[PDB]
């Protein structure tokens, strides 16, 4: 219940903005607690596994190529329906339709520059963290802090 | 018109994280003027008082023994509409469904921990007020600043 | 597409208040590019050209009279769908009725100080631009972002 | 001894300024905790016993006439060398003078409109405390928080 | 005298970076009333006036070249001390020795890209200014605000 | 060589306190880029060897176990002077010395609660990253940014 957890991955457009830290911090002012980060290269594969459902999308190829060019910052909260929550913080798909207050409706204008990606359900979120995060990178026994949950 | 206030409270879970300065600074900037304030430990009777319309429900004991748990800071804020205004800046019920800008939205996530609790109505407004403040704790002559009234 | 233009104005009451760099960062973080700007008092002519659609409202002259009573700072701001994107940034019209992350919606209470005016449609924003600020005044080569746009 | 106090008070100028919430949040961060809050409007007896130190001061009269001219938000914080530190947050006595970073560094410019007073000793915090507030509107349970104190 | 003058300029750096409404905010706060506002691309004729005093540089035609590289944001403020203040503000020559707190020890690490440029006194500033703006861009009614000047 | 690379580490009190965006953000501000981050629980032998220049110091084995007490995130800035830019930006060992704009001046009160860990010497950083961080883990490409540098 409490314990579940999302996939973050600040975009290559992101790191190059130095907006990490921005972003980190939104999340930690929430309450969700970071239970893994890195800073990495994404591979050609890793690219095309995390966005599968996407193949056969004219924009897939783009999007492959965009991921992989620069470092990308990984990270894993934890906390009461973070999944969707996280959604709600980073916005829409479209940056100009993403609210003021969300991370894309903040900083973001182009679909292709999104700033930040994040999975879209409990389902999707166990695939990308397994996918991204070794067993080990994960902190375990994670308690909960009395001033935010009852 | 431009006279009506709310009561505000900072919960003991927004006390204890110090977000006392954050709340206050955003009604300060929205332009809403500040004619009470004041630290206090809530006395179970004033816990049961505030909240009476919930005294049948479940979890009211559980909210009262926490709301007299640790120190809470309580406002007044007058200004135009500042009733429901306050409650849009607040955002809903659920931390989780509050949209980001709103201060449950952008650092809350249980219901029990929802960091402040403001009036939903003059009705009520003017009863809290009342119950948590005297008369000469709260500013008389209050002049509209021209930069935020017409 | 990605050249387009809106105008944007911090009213009297805006720039009285020291809102002028927050309004002007909130514009650069969202990544729209600012190609026109200065300080000036408006001059009855001017007010009432960049109102001319509300001539025959009850409080034109109110708003008039507002407008040149002080300094305004009017921008130009390019990017993907920005005019859109810069009226939701704002709000709507009541800054009461505005969501927090919008600028009234943060910082306004009187549709009479709404703190920011700004184009509400392409045809507008082309007329507004033309109308406060003469063609050597605006930036022209302007180079996209390649980590705003793909 | 983390049990330490000092006497803090934002002027009449720093609360028309709105600078009530930035304030009280920069000693937040600090680690340091909300004793005692409240505003009124200082009492000439008040004012002139505060700053009777300085009782043979051309612009004593001035001084009193300016702190009892409107509201005042006092507060009392409590933590390792709070006296000295709360001061070096504060900046010096001219605000031209007070380096950025510090509050009247960042917000002040004239020694008359200093935003925030606070104690110069512990000898002095302790006069000033017990001059501001009852011993019954102090925070009695002094819990040292394990983040910030080991 | 509170009618001190300088003249305040974001460097093509700095708009790049989009800087320039953390700068204006920055000197808001301070209280300091912008007077003159505009952006410009500026000439050879201009950069060369404007660091004449260091014509006898082996790096002058290579400021020269940077300074009218980009556009430029140029700005005048007005208030007490306000020259040196605002020297203090922006940090030393080096960026990497620039205190944080100060603009250049926030966000600036070479000379060559220092973010923002500031006269050196009261004498360089009236000079700078009549270079920079045109009497009719500087605002005439110069008034000042009573919770920042006595 | 704006090459230079430190080692920096968010202590696990900055983390419990939510610090870690903040920090991180402070340095993408400055214009220094990351080339390595991660989020672990430090090793008593890691622990060790980090602070194994006091080895000597009878507060030795209490650094260690709290070190080593939770989760920690260290980074890997470059840029010119970035060692002792970094230490600029943290402070100075004792938390109430540290200057407000620092990150220990702004946060912290207790030595051993520093928030943040620094390389003090260019020949210190080269060996913490290599103790801290694997080649693999670090970014190869170093692009320099024209806006940061010459
Ligand atoms: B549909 P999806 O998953 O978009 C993934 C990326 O696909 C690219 N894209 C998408 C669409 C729909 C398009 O028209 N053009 C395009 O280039 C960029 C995406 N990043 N996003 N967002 O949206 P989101 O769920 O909001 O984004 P992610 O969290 O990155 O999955
Ligand atoms: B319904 P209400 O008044 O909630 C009051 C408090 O009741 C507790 N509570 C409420 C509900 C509905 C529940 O399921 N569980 C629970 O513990 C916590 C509340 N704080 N809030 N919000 O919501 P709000 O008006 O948003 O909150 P307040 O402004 O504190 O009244
Ligand atoms: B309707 P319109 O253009 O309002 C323009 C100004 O008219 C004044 N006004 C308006 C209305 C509808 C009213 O009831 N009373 C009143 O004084 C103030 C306006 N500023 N705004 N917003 O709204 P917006 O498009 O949100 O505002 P602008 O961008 O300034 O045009
Ligand atoms: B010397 P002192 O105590 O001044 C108190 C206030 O008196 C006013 N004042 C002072 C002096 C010395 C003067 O020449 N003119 C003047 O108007 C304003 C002060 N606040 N300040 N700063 O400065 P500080 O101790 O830094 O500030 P306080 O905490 O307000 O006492
Ligand atoms: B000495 P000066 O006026 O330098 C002006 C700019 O010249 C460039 N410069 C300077 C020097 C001395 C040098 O060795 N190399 C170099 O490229 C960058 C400057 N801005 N700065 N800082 O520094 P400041 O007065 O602090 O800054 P300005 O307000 O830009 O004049
Ligand atoms: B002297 P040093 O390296 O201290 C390291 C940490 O050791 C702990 N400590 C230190 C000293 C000297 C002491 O008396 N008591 C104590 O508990 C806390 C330290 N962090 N700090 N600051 O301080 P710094 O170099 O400023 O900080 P680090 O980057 O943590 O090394
Ligand atoms: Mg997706
Ligand atoms: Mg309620
Ligand atoms: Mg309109
Ligand atoms: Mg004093
Ligand atoms: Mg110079
Ligand atoms: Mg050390």
Known sequence: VNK???????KP????RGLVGEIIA???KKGFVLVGLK???PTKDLAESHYAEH?????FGGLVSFITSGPVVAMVFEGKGVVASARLMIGVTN??????????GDFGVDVGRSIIGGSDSVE?????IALWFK????????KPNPNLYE
């Open 13 to 16: 457009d992101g790191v190059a």
């Open 95 to 104: 940056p100009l339709a993403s609210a003021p207050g969300s991370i894309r």
């Open 26 to 28: 939104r999340y930690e």
């Open 135 to 142: 067993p080990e990178e994960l902190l375990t026994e994670v």
């Open 39 to 41: 800073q990495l290269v």
């Open 55 to 59: 193949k056969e999308r004219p924009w």
């Open 4 to 10: 579940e957890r999302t996939f973050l991955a600040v």
């Open 124 to 128: 999707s979120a166990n695939r990308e």
